[PDB]
Amino acid sequence: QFKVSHPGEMIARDLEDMGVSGRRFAHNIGVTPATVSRLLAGKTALTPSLSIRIAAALGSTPEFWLRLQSNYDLRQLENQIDTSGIVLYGES
Amino acid sequence: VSHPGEMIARDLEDMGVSGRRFAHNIGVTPATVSRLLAGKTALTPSLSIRIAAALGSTPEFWLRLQSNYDLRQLENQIDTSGIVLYGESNEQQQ
Ligand SMILES: [K+]
Ligand SMILES: [K+]
Ligand SMILES: [K+]
Ligand SMILES: [K+]
Ligand SMILES: [K+]
């Protein structure tokens, strides 16, 4: 599996399973319902501040949530970055 | 906890590589590299792919250095005490 999920869609499923609305989740974590709506739709990133608030509501660590976002962003780049012409200066 | 740009700067210094030469190698503008090295802009996912190609390790590693930096500015700052952890036992203040 090359394509991986935006963390918003994992959150959306957890909220569905718990019977928790986007608005109620936003009020619990202390952000606007508009922010949550965009996050759940995968239209905005799970930022460092959001990761702290989300870990407090859904568990694990802020680092976990951020890692999911980073992983999504890398795979979304697809073929955009040709690395074949980049000379290795370090060690790999 | 240093910004990852300043870690890169030290590596470039050790290799005798200017910021401009590094920018040309990784395929971005010297302005972008200059801002990164000064800690004035974030190490993004696209940059992490290019940087991993030039300096080694994985894109995820460079992104983790950036995340660590960002979270160190905030984990001591944001009050989570009002946030319910769903499914946990109700809080009981003594
Ligand atoms: K995979
Ligand atoms: K479910
Ligand atoms: K409310
Ligand atoms: K942490
Ligand atoms: K280093």
Side-chain angles (χ1 to χ4, degrees):
Chain A
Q1 209 86 63
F2 185 76
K3 301 170 178 169
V4 295
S5 150
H6 192 284
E9 70 158 282
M10 301 161 51
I11 293 170
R13 295 200 292 274
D14 190 24
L15 298 188
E16 181 66 37
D17 294 335
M18 294 182 307
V20 173
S21 71
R23 157 171 267 267
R24 166 150 145 241
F25 182 67
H27 293 170
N28 184 36
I29 71 169
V31 308
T32 58
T35 293
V36 165
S37 180
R38 294 174 89 202
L39 185 72
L40 300 182
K43 290 172 165 157
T44 194
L46 205 169
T47 60
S49 295
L50 278 184
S51 78
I52 293 171
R53 295 175 172 284
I54 289 169
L58 302 189
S60 191
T61 64
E63 290 86 351
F64 170 75
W65 294 104
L66 279 190
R67 205 150 58 228
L68 297 179
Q69 180 66 55
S70 293
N71 289 355
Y72 170 77
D73 293 332
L74 288 165
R75 300 306 177 81
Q76 287 292 315
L77 289 163
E78 292 193 341
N79 63 341
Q80 294 300 320
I81 305 163
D82 176 24
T83 63
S84 64
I86 301 177
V87 176
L88 180 53
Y89 298 164
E91 199 167 16
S92 184
Chain B
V1 188
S2 298
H3 190 288
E6 73 188 87
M7 294 164 178
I8 291 165
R10 296 201 238 86
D11 293 350
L12 297 190
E13 276 152 36
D14 296 332
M15 296 180 310
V17 173
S18 70
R20 179 184 269 188
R21 183 153 198 120
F22 186 66
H24 276 15
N25 184 40
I26 73 171
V28 305
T29 60
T32 293
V33 169
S34 184
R35 291 177 317 108
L36 184 67
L37 298 183
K40 293 171 166 198
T41 197
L43 204 165
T44 61
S46 60
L47 281 174
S48 78
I49 294 176
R50 302 171 179 285
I51 289 168
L55 302 187
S57 191
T58 65
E60 290 84 349
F61 170 74
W62 294 104
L63 288 174
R64 169 79 202 215
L65 293 182
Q66 182 64 56
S67 290
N68 287 353
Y69 174 82
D70 295 333
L71 288 170
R72 170 61 177 77
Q73 318 310 305
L74 293 167
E75 278 185 307
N76 295 319
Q77 283 281 295
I78 295 173
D79 180 20
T80 62
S81 61
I83 302 176
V84 174
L85 177 45
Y86 290 119
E88 286 292 278
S89 298
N90 287 349
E91 170 188 66
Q92 310 162 107
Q93 292 179 9
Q94 294 290 165

